[PDB]
Symmetry: D2
Subunit: 329 residues, 4 copies
Amino acid sequence: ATLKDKLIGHLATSQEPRSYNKITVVGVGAVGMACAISILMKDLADEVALVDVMEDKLKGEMMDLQHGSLFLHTAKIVSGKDYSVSAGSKLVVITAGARQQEGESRLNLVQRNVNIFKFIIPNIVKHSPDCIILVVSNPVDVLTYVAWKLSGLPMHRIIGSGCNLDSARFRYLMGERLGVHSCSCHGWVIGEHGDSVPSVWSGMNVASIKLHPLDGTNKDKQDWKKLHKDVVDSAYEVIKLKGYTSWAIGLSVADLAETIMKNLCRVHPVSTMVKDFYGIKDNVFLSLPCVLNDHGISNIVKMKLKPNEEQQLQKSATTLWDIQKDLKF
Amino acid sequence: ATLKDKLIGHLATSQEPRSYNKITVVGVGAVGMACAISILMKDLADEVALVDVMEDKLKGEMMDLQHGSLFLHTAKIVSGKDYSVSAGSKLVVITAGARQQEGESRLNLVQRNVNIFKFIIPNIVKHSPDCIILVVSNPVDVLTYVAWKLSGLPMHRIIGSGCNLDSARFRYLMGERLGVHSCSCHGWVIGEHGDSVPSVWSGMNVASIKLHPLDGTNKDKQDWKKLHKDVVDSAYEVIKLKGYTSWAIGLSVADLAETIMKNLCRVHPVSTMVKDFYGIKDNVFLSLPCVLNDHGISNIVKMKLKPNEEQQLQKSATTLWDIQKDLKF
Amino acid sequence: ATLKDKLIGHLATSQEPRSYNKITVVGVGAVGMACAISILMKDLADEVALVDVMEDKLKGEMMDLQHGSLFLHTAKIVSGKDYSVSAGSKLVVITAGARQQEGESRLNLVQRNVNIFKFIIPNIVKHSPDCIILVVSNPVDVLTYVAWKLSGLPMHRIIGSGCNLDSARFRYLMGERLGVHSCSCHGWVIGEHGDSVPSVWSGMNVASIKLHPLDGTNKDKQDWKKLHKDVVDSAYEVIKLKGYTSWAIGLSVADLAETIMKNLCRVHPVSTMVKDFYGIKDNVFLSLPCVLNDHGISNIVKMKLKPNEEQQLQKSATTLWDIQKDLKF
Amino acid sequence: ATLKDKLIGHLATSQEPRSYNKITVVGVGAVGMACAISILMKDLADEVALVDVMEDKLKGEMMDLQHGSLFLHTAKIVSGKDYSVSAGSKLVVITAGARQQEGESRLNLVQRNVNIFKFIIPNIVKHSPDCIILVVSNPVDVLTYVAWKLSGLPMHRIIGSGCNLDSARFRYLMGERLGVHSCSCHGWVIGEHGDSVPSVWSGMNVASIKLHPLDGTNKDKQDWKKLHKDVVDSAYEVIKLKGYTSWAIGLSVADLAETIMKNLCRVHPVSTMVKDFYGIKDNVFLSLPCVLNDHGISNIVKMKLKPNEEQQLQKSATTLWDIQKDLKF
């Protein structure tokens, strides 16, 4: 004598409710909502759980998203302040962090994040024993290490956003300059995400044709080098203009989630453990071209760098290991 | 002796550059960026031009989006303060408006928008003679009329967001209550978008089964009516929580753009000219189920409303026509 | 000293290879290859295994498909004569059957299929303990029962193609006649798939508007009834013309696989156990609007049929139960 | 007093029906139906017209496809024996040809096709003044030239399937051998489609890493060369097995149609006019990496081939120009 009872019947047999391609997003900031609507519009997960400390914002973010249910293909969207809401995720994207202050040292900024992360990550793993973690949070190479360390996960289930977006930018900028789509242009920015990102000049090509062999070359002087500077700059440009970044980043991450979720074995410049790779001896994460599948990092693509390059590589590893003087102040 | 010249050759024959499924978005606010990334993730247009008065924000919004080029299928993204940037669009989405103030009258709020719109819309049509306009801006029924009036477009090329999102919400809320996806549940909120939205109780169904016939009925008393109140409420809920709305709205609009762009002849509850429909005698826009194709509104779905219902319909038309005392103060 | 060894390195940690959204197709005929390329183009499974007895055809079908790898998003395609190739599937689509001969009785045609199925289905379940089965094979209602019976699966994990495609056809034909897309038109053909399919005249509508109330009505005389006859006819038309059916069927099935795989709770007219539903007392499968999720049939949509209708319903159940005099000749 | 009249009303203003992203397929064989369902499942056109001489087969092919309307996003599917049905297409895919007989000379096989094509292509262009033509028909390089010649189209609006699928195969086979997805592996088969296809050993790479530099090299002896032989062989393998090819080819072509239709400027190894490119002096079509947009071939990617390679290139051009002794017998 309920509408529901009058209109929906039952087979004699049934099985407890279920989610198998669950994904969780931590942080409902600009990066987090951006990451979350790109996964949803991509139909990568049969469940998306949203987790932040900001009650109100979380709930409202959650609702905005549910109201659009009709337009999507993800059955269940949820949000929680509590981590148990994330219980049973395939993949976790972390986008929560502090942003670096007036007179803040990279050491002190990294410490602040360690103390937030101590509360996030341990709870993630306990609710999600079989998850893979994807760290977007900047500084990414150090926050990746931290996440690694705080969780207790096999190193292959710990991935850093790293240098994917930067490469996506480089490829864009080649493309504009060359007149071909960004996806026909191929170049790789690897190493330590940011100012200290190495641009593999010698891997740049179109159709299989090496720019380097054609332009007479190029690395040292006659405007092309520029292409790397506003890859890193044009990024501050954005902020100076809009007051934050979200869109390209979110998309970048759905790109990663599709590979992983669809078990593709697609090659991405992501932040990995590069220990005893290119003469690096300690526990440092930086970008290298990795194959990804559903269990995280399946393999590494061994570039053949110049010394010039691997030298630079090593200077990041040192500089990062140095910071790794963490656990308090 | 240019890399570009060394690497890209030419056929003897070629034809001036081209965009045919161009879409333009006005306003790079929360609604506008939301509308813009849903169209892009949907691959509805071979060009997206972004237009706002806020230089900085526009440029940076534009860039964020371009950097993600690799991840999309839209060849050209652009932004301009100038309207000529929008030159040649199939569809224009307007999301620019004033938000209603302390002690603001719906009359005075509508006037403020008339004076902004005087600068937007006339320029749109001159640059885009064959466009269709889609108004998202609230109050939508009145802003639709204004856009109609300011442009000089056939009435069928002027559409209002109207009551689509509200219906999408109603359908969601049925769904949660019934245990079926929002897309198997069917109900329609029509009329004047907002508090004065009519819920067609008698069209509600699942598989073809009318709830009304089953629940003994329902319209007047025993909790179901609720379903309409937090459809309109849960909307303020969102704002009170997040401080704005974007996500469900953007998705809502891509839903509309796909129909139009793909010439589908899909039925949507959108804001149209309802003049001499349901005994309405003047130049008022409200929601009715419309068929859409690439030329805007192809037809109207003639509901069979009760008087109770059409009465309510008429009270909006009156109330709106009343406001239509526009052009200044 | 292998290219592979020179170019691909390893993290110290890794985990055995994996497929989680595996789907298997039995039969590489017109229906089977059609079903198989629609799932692939839909990105519903991270593995598709193809199974037939015809070695050659299987292998070549398999290869055609792999060669297109670059164009898809399914990581692993395989084929086997052996059933162990299907080991670990979420969903199994069966499209293998005999086609009915000169002077063949529905009884004798159903028997022939029982003897083929004895070899297929038992092996499916042993390799795939947690699969759901989807029977496309005609006669579908009886072959569904057989599959049910031969496997030992909970009744909810046994689905019949049933009346989905027929409904899809009815909706098409309404649409052409009405001028609206087939997805805005809503009508339901249920019951026993084929000549004996009941068209729920009274659920037909557009936007929520019941044709029945508008056309003065219609069920008995003034050309509309036709709409049901060439729904069933236009189907023989096809064969008489092309020599088989594949395209609409395959698409129909991907529609079903998406619901199930994405856990949607979407309502489909599929062949289910209708025992003690509409006064049916025995173990007969026919179509009813079902909600589907990842565990097969989650619920039934209780239509409110007329006697005229449920009578017809009962005449199928009888006629089918009669055939169910199976196990040999 | 028509249901249609009782239920669908009108705005006072409207505009004649319309298709803007129209695509036409010639030939409803295995290649043609394969090409046609991949475009449809891809949502590349708001209209698909199907053209063959075989009445029955055409009609039935057409119907199969329409019945699935509900499952797609293309508004209008049509078929005609007459070419006016194709009136107004953006793109035309030709898949009609003769298949080469017992004791048939490539000269005589090419002549047979010239006489079929005389009836197809001239009519295409008259109904579709602004179309681009895409030839799938084998021998592709010669049939492309013929289509070029019979139509009177700018050379950039005449494209040959060429060497795309072959490259897609090579990439697959690298991938299986390397353990990375076919889309992270990059190699190019260019030149004259088939046995005489040149494999650019020196452009092969993963992430930007040249296999050639790593394997010590490879071109001449130690099993890798194989990779090219069963690229061309494994193709006969398929036929010997299945009795034809369709699937990988169709997908291949949707890949091309997406680029063109979405104006991407994506680089494809397609059959173009290579006249005075690599010391070729006459009117011969072969594969080169081309940028494509909506007007056909926008540019050519100038590889830097070895003589060994360009020599081979020239031997095709000669051999093809030789055949070009066409117009009768």
